[PDB]
Paper text:
Two members of the FABP family are found in hepatic cells; [name]-type FABP ([name]) and intestinal-type FABP (FABP2). [name] is unique among the FABP family because its large binding cavity confers the ability to bind two fatty acid ligands simultaneously. Furthermore, [name] treatment induces hepatocyte accumulation of endocannabinoids in an [name]-dependent manner, likely indicating competition for [name]-mediated cellular uptake. Here, we demonstrate that [name] plays a major role in governing [name] biotransformation and metabolism by facilitating its cytoplasmic transport to hepatic CYP450 enzymes.
Examination of the mFo − DFc electron density maps after initial structure refinement revealed the presence of density in the binding cavities of three [name] molecules that could be modeled as [name]. The density was weakest for the cyclohexene ring possibly resulting from alternative conformations of this ring in the structure. Weaker density was observed but not modeled in the binding pockets of the other [name] copies, likely representing lower occupancy [name] molecules resulting from the poor solubility of [name] in aqueous solution. Examination of the [name] binding site revealed that the conjugated rings of the cannabinoid occupy a hydrophobic pocket within the [name] cavity lined by the sidechains of Phe18, Met19, Ile22, Ile52, Met74, Phe95, Phe98, Met113, and Phe120. Additionally, the O1 atom of the pyran ring is well placed to form a hydrogen bond with Asn111. The hydrocarbon tail of [name] extends out towards the pocket entrance close to the sidechains of Phe50, Ile91, Thr102 and Phe93. Importantly, the bulky [name] molecule occupies the majority of the [name] binding cavity consistent with the binding of a single cannabinoid molecule observed in our fluorescence measurements. A comparison of our [name] bound structure to [name] in complex with palmitic acid reveals that [name] occupies a largely non-polar pocket some distance from the more polar environment of the fatty acid.
Numbering used by the authors:
A (entry chain F), B (entry chain A): -8 to 127
Amino acid sequence: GTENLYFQSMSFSGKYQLQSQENFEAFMKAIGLPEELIQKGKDIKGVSEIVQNGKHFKFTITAGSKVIQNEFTVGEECELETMTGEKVKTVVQLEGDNKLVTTFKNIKSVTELNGDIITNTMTLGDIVFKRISKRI
Amino acid sequence: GTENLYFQSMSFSGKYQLQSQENFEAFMKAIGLPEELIQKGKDIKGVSEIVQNGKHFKFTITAGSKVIQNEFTVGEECELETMTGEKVKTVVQLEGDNKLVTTFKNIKSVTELNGDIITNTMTLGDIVFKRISKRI
Ligand SMILES: CCCCCc1cc(O)c2c(c1)OC(C)(C)[C@@H]1CCC(C)=C[C@@H]21
């Protein structure tokens, strides 16, 4: 026999304007981002978009001077393009009704949606890369 | 708005008779179980029960000379009682259709159901506490 595990989450779909950003320079250096691109995009506060259809997600992230697009299904292994352009395979999971959690290359990524504010925290050792964006 | 995330797993419900057990003493020593209780329950091969109703689990596990009962919902943070009686808060996740995975106090716990055979693997550093039970 089989069991049905049905979940319900807040809609992550929407366009989000980057407002706050912590430890950008430190984090990009740890992952090996060139200093040229670090200073070029450290002050860029762009707009990211999420498209959620059930457990499927489409991410369009404006990070610094780069636009990185990725797609995944919750609970299924996916190939994600990192900030450094390297492609890693990982699984994204839903915690509660508003947290998207994944871990790749010693980076613990947590994306929590609180109302119109979405917070993406990425921890690499002592570095806590925290981004705060608002739905527009 | 809200989104629906539909998952399906094998039914974990049933009573399971412990058959094989490796590194009981080493694991219980690592978590600080008193040596009196370690020798007392190292050879006990009891029966554990799982009650799964969708994404909610009720499991009564016979570990050594202790009967520990806990309840949780997959993806939601819950409070679990450990072997040492300490209560920890963690999140249990479903991997595939037959794996229940969680991590607490540097202990990676994996419970995999392959047909009528259930395998409980708990890794704490170098110690791999492996329990193999059969549904009865
Ligand atoms: C259904 C899986 C969710 C996690 C359940 C989970 C939690 C837990 O309290 C225990 C579980 C596994 O299995 C045994 C082998 C009895 C453990 C022995 C040593 C420790 C620290 C605690 C025991």
